[PDB]
Design a protein around this nucleic acid. Structure first.
Ligand SMILES: Nc1nc2c(ncn2[C@@H]2O[C@H](COP(=O)(O)OP(=O)(O)O)[C@@H](O)[C@H]2O)c(=O)[nH]1
Length: 140
RNA sequence: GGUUUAGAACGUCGUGAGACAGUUCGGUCCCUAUCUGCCGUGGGCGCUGGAGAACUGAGGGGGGCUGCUCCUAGUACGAGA
């Protein structure tokens, strides 16, 4: 039947202030689980999370697009888990994408910058996370 | 090439020879550099015995132009662009 027991699923959300590195960390995760070669960047648009061609050119993630992989914690790189990341955007203009995403995840790794710490958009998505008690960790 | 010479015409003016910041076609542009000047290149003499070399360097001339891309760097700035 199903390929994996439920305890191997981790539905996590990546969300933060603009440019805090959500898409970069998502592409790094995809590479480190091996569904992506060529780690790639965003300012050169070659990243694969970005398709709509606006975020290709303008280099700003505008809408969430879920993605899956197989990374593992028990004897890591082995005994695969199912991490469903959702690369959400952090723009106040697109906070609606965070809203519906934050309401649909069971956890979410918040991203913070080490230069500015929290930022107004992060203080916003913090309300959008307390709004649903979405469990969460921070990634500086 | 044009402007303004001789040929020619149109429009216009003049009765006319002709004329017009009106137009059109055609229409010869000379000079062996003496001096000054400047580019170079020498011959004489000096420089205090003659000669051969190497120099120092007064002083003068040449050369001084820049773009793009990459890195720094998606950094600082900016809520974001
Ligand atoms: N120095 C540094 N720059 C980063 C990091 N993550 C992202 N960036 C830069 O941030 C710019 C855009 O990153 P992006 O993926 O758009 O961040 P996001 O907008 O939050 O997803 C790019 O030029 C990256 O070079 C990081 O961990 N360190």
């Amino acid at each position: 039947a199903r390929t994996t027991p439920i305890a191997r699923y981790r539905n996590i959300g990546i969300s933060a202030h603009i440019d805090a590195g959500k898409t970069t960390t998502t592409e790094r995760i995809l590479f480190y689980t091996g569904v992506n070669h060529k780690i790639g960047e965003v300012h050169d648009g070659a990243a694969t999370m970005d398709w709509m061609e606006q975020e290709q050119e303008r280099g700003i993630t505008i809408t969430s697009a879920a993605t899956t992989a197989f990374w593992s914690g028990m004897a890591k790189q082995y005994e695969p888990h199912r991490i469903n990341i959702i690369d959400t955007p952090g723009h106040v203009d697109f906070t609606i994408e965070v809203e519906r995403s934050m309401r649909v995840l069971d956890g979410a790794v918040m991203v913070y910058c080490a230069v500015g710490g929290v930022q107004p958009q992060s203080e916003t998505v913090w309300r959008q996370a307390n709004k649903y008690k979405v469990p969460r960790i921070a990634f500086v």
